[model samples]
Target: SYPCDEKVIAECSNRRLQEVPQTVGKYVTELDLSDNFITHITNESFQGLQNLTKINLNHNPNGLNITDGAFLNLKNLRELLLEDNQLPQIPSGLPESLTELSLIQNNIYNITKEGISRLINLKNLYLAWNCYFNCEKTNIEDGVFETLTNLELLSLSFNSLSHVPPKLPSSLRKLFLSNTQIKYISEEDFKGLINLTLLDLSGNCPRCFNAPFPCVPCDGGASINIDRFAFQNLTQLRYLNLSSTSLRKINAAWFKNMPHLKVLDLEFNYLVGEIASGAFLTMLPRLEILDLSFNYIKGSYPQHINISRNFSKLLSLRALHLRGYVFQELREDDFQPLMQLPNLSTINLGINFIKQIDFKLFQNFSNLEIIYLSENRISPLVFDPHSNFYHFTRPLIKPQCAAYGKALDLSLNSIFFIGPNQFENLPDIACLNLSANSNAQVLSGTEFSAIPHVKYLDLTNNRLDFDNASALTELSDLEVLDLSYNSHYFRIAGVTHHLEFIQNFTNLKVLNLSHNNIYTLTDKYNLESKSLVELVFSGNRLDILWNDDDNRYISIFKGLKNLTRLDLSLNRLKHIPNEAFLNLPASLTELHINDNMLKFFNWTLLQQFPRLELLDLRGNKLLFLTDSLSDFTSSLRTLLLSHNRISHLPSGFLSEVSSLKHLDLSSNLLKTINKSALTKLSMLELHGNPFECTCDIGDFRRWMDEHLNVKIPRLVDVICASPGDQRGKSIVSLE
Candidate 1:
């Protein structure tokens, strides 16, 4: 048997090695061996360990030195992970049988090829993610990976690989080179990638070919060149991702040839261009989805897209996702010619910056069902005699009420008030979202009573108040109501299956009273008599739910059984009782407790709810998460811990969050972390922390490497707040 769960040697214990007996080879096969207080690992100390196969002696706090030929006797070694242990000299003697090696992610500035090339049998290697990105390598004479023909994965993902290397082993399949300052790739750069399926040029400045033309260039900059297809040599390429690159334009000749291509994503390249005439004429028979979001495209072209002659000419096209900056102006003459697409169903123009739409533009697509026009500066169209848009508004009295399918979004605009008979024309509109505008106010009694048959109304983030409460109460047929972030004063009381007269609109399945001044449920007059299933009192001054007249102590939520999602964020609560969610129906799975005041989370309280899946505790004054969470969660997948006072993360707190997949530790005062403290976490969000990127940062770095699925992209300007000596000094970079 082995010391299956035990180890004889431990590091970081702050203990000296001379005081202990020389029992090195007793039975130990692996040693934590690093980060301990021992000053040196003498040859005599290693005389007993002849069978050790792996070693991890890094990140120590005391003076430590390994003698030359330190591991010459242990020939069975296969892997070595040495980095950031403050070792002044290189450990020269190592078994030649090593198959995997890594010396990156450290502070060593000087090294020789003879030291790294000794492991000729190394198959998988990593010299990337080091303190040096574009530095000269001194180990070239060591014949490094040049001898390891079996190398499968070489990670240089975050290095400054500006110059393209020549003749990477022809057998190599996956090469990680992201976030580097590499801009040029010669014609012979990728000649070896015959089996290449995924090429991540992401986070680089590739020449954007299909990027939209910029809004009339404000500066006197020269127009982009014509050669955008500079990297098409990878003939077998299937998936290509290029985002955040310094791309300029989308030329007409960029999409030529390569019939096998399937998907293309070009997001956030700051691309600026317009979909000029005949831009979409060539329908790639295999292309299914086209993504062009978050670019700086100003669609000044007429909506009439020349997307191939007939619909079948571009037969394989299914989805066209256009965004705020990517959508062009819609003109009836523009789309009238392409009406032959007998098979198209979805026309996604969501969040496009198209304001003045020519209504007659949609007359041809009776086949259209979903049209998204969210997040734009749009308004009701008025007749302009001088323009050519007179025919588009002739059919509709109010030009802005362009007729469409089940849902329509007119959010984030400056339309202050809903004029009379606004929705009297949208015959098919069932759901509408008119949120996030400074001008949108409550409707008068007569204004709301005219929208013939609106079922879903989203009037969030505006100014609707008691003065217009009567107007909202008139929508008897309403099913879902969202009057959140409006008049800071609103709520209902009593029990009425239907609130037709403000108390019988019984069809109400969802009622959002969030971001308001609702203190009591019917506790105030004029709001009496209402039976509700789902209610949101979030972002209010509600310290507790009020029920029994003036008592304010009992749980009115104790009996409501139909409640689903409850948001109580940004409230004045110190410690929430375990019965908070229990007051509602069993359907409640998401609870927003963000922006509250709970110092320490007793994971034990989480076990009270069987179905709770999401718990948001962001922006609290908690010192740290509980160390004992074994019984806290198994079903908990998302835990938001942003903007808190959690400076140090202790061990065992994560063991309780077993199934946790998404955790946000952003905006905290965390100075450092021990990788072993959180080994099982999958998706971590530590973006806004004041991370002290010192020598101790290797704890978080090594953790990201051992777990191949995790990623920590050397945060941009990660704050360094430690070592007293480096205080107030600029660290310049992070790893």
Candidate 2:
């Protein structure tokens, strides 16, 4: 009932038809019959289409009646699309040359063995978003996939299946079964899949995938019973996901058989007792990663159960994450078994209740490289100057921990002062994170003298003593520094003096000062660092980003000629002060000033960046661009102006940048783009705007078709909102 290309392409979609149109070509190789009202598919549906290889019949609102042998005539068919249909079962007598078949979002409840057995060459199957069986019991008839030896990937997720399929092809490698009603995992559930390497069984209910603070707890709040040998036959499996199952216990022999397991996830379970000793010693002996976070797990105290003895069996483990636990303190013996793991490298204990520390807890982990202990209640001693030398309560460690480099994350804790000897044994740790610990009141002048090898330091959100800002000058090897999210308004002098001390770190490359309560800029905090490359100062409470007072801000950044990127998002300002950003570094290639209060663009000042390639100015209050953009930027390639108030632009406003490739104008007040604008853009986004329907948009539609090489990602969302007759129509369908 629509256009046809006789021997090549056929486009017959949405003509209010009840059956296959007789005008369809018999020799076409491709056909697009999607979004139609076709109801029945009988033996005569495609009788003479012997040369057809691919056909699409997706998004049919009416139920489809696909009788047996409906597509028997397409002998050379290779690809078929049957998604968003109402087929009760897979019809018979289909071509055997199919390599891809989609039956997703269908009403089929049964998969007989004879339906898919004939397609021996099928390599990919998509049966997701269907009700395979009742939630209480699932008994698949055997041999459904026995003949599919060439199959490699199968997705049965988002279905109401209560059990794993009885059998899968022996050559299958990956299986996805998330968001289902699967209640238990038994031994026979995965019997013959010996070559499978990945399995996913997560997403049982709402809140299945969220932060670990409060994870999914299952429907009606019950735990699923897991068989100790549920995965014993899967020796080749390397990745396993058992998250959000509401499991109550960790079985003694649950993982004894998966010796080669590389990643194991047991998050969102409820473990309240000690693990059986020697269980992990034999179970998962070569495991590399284990994530036991957010389970509310509680192991017996060291005096009652030797928790360290159980984990020591993971001889090849590299990372162990136990975050968001309920434990408040860890005794020195809590990690006694960790001292023996030669390759144990990364450890995470965040969002826990740990308060005090036992320095001996990590002294023996010589190979340890990264430790994450943030989001805890740790308040370290202040090391008062009047205290006796022998009474110092600072934590100490073995010298072996300072091999070459390490990253220690102590953010989100409650530590006040840093003791000089606290890290005396770890001099080569390159990265230190102490952000978000707002209670850390003061920093001594000699606090960091013990570890001069630090390359990165993060002290965001903490109020450091500005009077003693010179204390950090001892870190000669520092390269990157982050001091965001602090009360810099009241401590501007402190920050200014701190920058006076930062001149010693000549090797510094990146600096972050975002989310600070900064009201203005000054030359006081602008010291010299010839190696600086990136600067971030977003979320500051500044009405202007520059200092007009004797070119103070210009003097602050003009010396750093190597600067390439600068971020100044979330700074509310009505206008740009003249000469505010003039004489910036020519090497700056990226600039971010989004989420401001500007009603107009300062093109003169913005052009100061010579080699700028990317610019983000989203969420402004501009109503129009009333000038030519012939010289906006020399090499601009990407522009983001979404969530703005721009309603119009000059027809050739974007012709200035010949290298522009990507443009985002989403969530704006524009109705349509000019025909001549964005000629060279290869990617454009323009959704979330009110588009007027009528002959007004026909020109824009033709322009979109003229430049077929340009990609309009949100073309479907460019719907109509004017002219009552075509108000509910998509702009793509209007013409």
Candidate 3:
């Protein structure tokens, strides 16, 4: 029986039936018979199903034996999917009205003119994942697709098609032949695909299929030799992905056709030449996005210009990805060509070896929006750390890399010093990524005077002191700031003004300070704090000075009246002071304080947030709960208190939190549980606990056995912990 609502779409999956359910609705148009045991099907199996347009019989791996004329009467059939089956051959007698057919993983070897060639109206044909063809030679007939005149989409990937087919349909729009042993692209190979729009020829390397070639940035395998004019006829092509084809270089006449191409993905190839001067100038005038990343462009340019000088002529160019090219230094005229393309917005030059860049590289680009230079060599003190404090030395990045862009990425570099006016030209910058740089130690607060419009800043894996934080006051509109993975400078002594400068960012919403050594939150009410929405302080040492007289969390989080989400997990917090979170906003919903050392803290601290939804106190080494836990609000929906030492729960322990929908108490010392403790729980996880098989667990075992909706993962791991003979045995096994 199927629980189908729409009579037109019958979903009979996982029914374990030997044949198609005869009781299926008569007017059903789409039938999903996947994951069933229908081994044999005949013409009479679907005799009355005249309106069936689509049928999915995939994953019937026990061998779906079909008669030759099984689908002969379904004249209006449109789609037939028979994938992941044990069929030895394709089912014949399909109606000519069919439009789509997928026969993947059916263990079929070859297709002659006798099979599937009669479906002239077919539009989409997927024959991937076939194990029938011998890798040495594909047994497909010469004119296998000769009769599919109207075919639009054909995917021959994951098959042993030794070479490109002879005469493909000219009406084809999308063709995918990846992961094949196709060796070369001759002039006559793609002659018929004139209307092709998207072609993915990735992972087709005939040269390295059986023979090893010298490693020249080979993607997936070596190269596939292509004649220059192979794609000259595909003038209407819009998107072409030739990545991982292993072509050595692109000469001038390669992309002469496909002038209307908008997106071209040529990443992961062996083309390492000066590209901006070649055929791309004459071709792809309407191109909007071009991805040439992950290539080995290691040669020096004729002039000091790094990129192609012809790139400036592509008036419609908007985005360009040039990552992993081993660029050493970006000279003054490196990206000068893009200044002519007024629509140029995004440029990704990440994962290179660029050591420095001129300040005026992107001086007058009025429309430039984003520039990425991550994972490169942009610093000098990458491996060296010394104090040039009290005064500035020679700055590594002189002048500017860009002037008018909205966002900049200088992450994963070794830049050490930040002298004044380094970013003096960018006043409208919004987002900046300078993370993972050892030389990002700020010298003065005026270093960021130019970028006053900064909103988002990611400085992870850097070092900062209270003096360094003083630089953030200039960014009045900053919203999201991530200082995670920063050095343990917060734990050092003599660093005053702890987080006091955060009030300067009036629009701050999210702050991530995880993996630091933060102990207390002290605010002298110097300024009203902004309403932060999310705050993360995980993986830190929050109990560093818990014993100090003045080291207390009083009104540190004041003025944050709109706070919603707070994460304080994975810390060394031995105690949560009574007034630690007294200043949190009433709009708070989620509180995550897991993986701490709160062994003797009062649980009533959570009573402040009556509207709280989720409370995660897992791995806190909690031994027992006081009566204060009874004050928990009924609005709590999810409670995660797992991986602790909770052996027993008090009577009516969760009477006030009965609205909880998800409860996780696994990996604890729970020997037994009161079945009435979690009556309203929709999901309960009690696995990984040493369950006692004695009579003390009779109530919980009986209730759990009766409750079918509660989810209990790893039920086998909840073995008996006591009573010698019953020990180490799952409770389900006992039942």
Candidate 4:
């Protein structure tokens, strides 16, 4: 009579059972006993479960100990999970048929040859994070994994090994040895792992120079010494990670054998030599992705580094990331060698000191799709008409071919004015991100007219003036636009007309206008957009509900027929008139009105929205819900009412909302909850509330126990705040 699904699988996890349940049917093939308090397993613990093929015993905080023959009877067990346990060692006498064994986050200190010699059929073995506190004593005897001839994936990271484990089976296709104490790599370490496709050795030789996290350097403050032929036999390796290894140079001979290598990551290292040599990359003819970010690639010189001619060998390369290179400028010759890569589509050059660029550097990239130049020092001189670099006769960028659906990211730069015709030649540009350019002041309105295919634009955190509505009228296909965090635009008088240009975007769907200091809605002209589906107007000063005429608030959003979400939080509004809610589209599903100053809310006003599914009313000033407020739409699934001044729920307030799945009542003044106040909800948040642990709440306490399916997150915080003796105690603990 156990919780068995499909008649052959038993799931008993998180039931707080002190011991293994013996009532599961003998025909059950999979048994999950994880997240329990079982500490010991006798020889007969699973004696009758001979058909068990998989068992999960993870997260036993009290530590688990098993007899030698505990799992000997389950001869068909194929997968066993014992992670997050306090086991001193690998359990003995495991079924030989087990193909996957996970022993991560345990207290094991040693792995002997005999411990896993019987698991010949094991394909995936996970033994990482086993000795975090006692890593110094952790050891794996030689040839411990040699008998796992069929193993395909092995993870031994986060251990304190002085060298790569010797005599690993050649059948492994993926291996992880990261965050270990391995200091040297030799040719014999991977002599026979020719089938390895992915190898991760990151953080083995920690680099502590200006590291954001605490880390100790390798012994003697030296980088790992790798033999010239360390990886000569890994011909099938595709992905290799050597980040944070403190290496000072990239030898061209190290990758001479990995012809199939597609991704090579050498980030967070001390590579301060000739990074532009391109000799090592020449060996990887099929390399598609290369990440050399966060390395001291630039030596003592301040000159631009020109790529070598050997880069033409990487014909299959598709992406190149060189972020944090500290380059001041990029010349056309710096990327002349990369133009030979026919499949190169992405180039990330963010987080640099770049101020000048040859706009023609990328004109030959016919297949380019994305270019990131964020967090640089590029100023308006690159596009302003008054600057010497501005080209008045022709566009700054004119690619030879049309690589439609391209994205250009210039966020976090110092550009202010985007002059006309700067982007005229890039007609295929689809997405542009110019956010966080705090000094941005003006747009010539004609700058974006050339890139008519742009679909998404982000102008948040800029100081641009939106006085010219023609600047965005040409974006007919734009679907998402973010104009948030530009407080200066709203400070100007009569700025409502500045935003009226949104109606010209015939396909715009999402618009974010939060933190714009808006004081009133547009009354003279309705904000019309039939295609817009979501709008954000939060963090404004719309405390007043009426316009200057003192009449009923106009239906400014009445034309947004398809709008589904509206955010009006942090407006400091005292009340929302009925006329304002009447203006919202009938297609609305989610309404965010949190962090306001309202004492009463008319629930009946929500009748305008027949499909409302979520209503967020947290952080308001309400007292109690009325009994008459029970006509919420059946589609309402989530109601967030936390941080309010409500004391109790009216009888039968939630009985009618059968579809309500989640409710939040935290930080309220509720004393007790009646048994009939809530329906069969899936989740409830009642923490930070003062509950009286008296007989009055006895029924509610029992109701909580009966509703086991209702997830009451932070239930421990629902403590008693009255009755001197039971104060500060959990209400569930009361007798």
Identify the leading candidate in terms of lDDT.
Answer: 4
Show the lowest summed lDDT stretch of 10 residues, model 4. Answer: 383-392
Error of 4 at 248 (Å): 4.7
Candidate 1 lowest-lDDT run of ten? 384-393
Model 1 has how many clashing residue pairs? Answer: 28
TM-score of 2: 0.72
Candidate 2 residue pairs that clash: 256-283
**For residues 59-102, what per-residue lDDT tens digits would candidate 2 score against the true structure?**
77648878777786677888899888877777777778888788
Question: On residues 96-141, what C-alpha lDDT tens digit does candidate 4 reach at each position?
Answer: 8889998887888989765688889999998887766454757888
State the lDDT of candidate 3 residue by residue for 118-149, as single tens digits. Answer: 88999999887675343344467777887898
| Candidate 2 lDDT score at position 376 | 72
CA shift of 197, model 3, Å: 1.1
lDDT comparing candidate 2 with the true structure: 0.68
Q: Please say which candidate is ahead in TM-score: 2 or 4.
A: 4
**lDDT per prediction?**
0.54, 0.68, 0.70, 0.76
Candidate with top TM-score is 4
lDDT of 1 at 211: 28
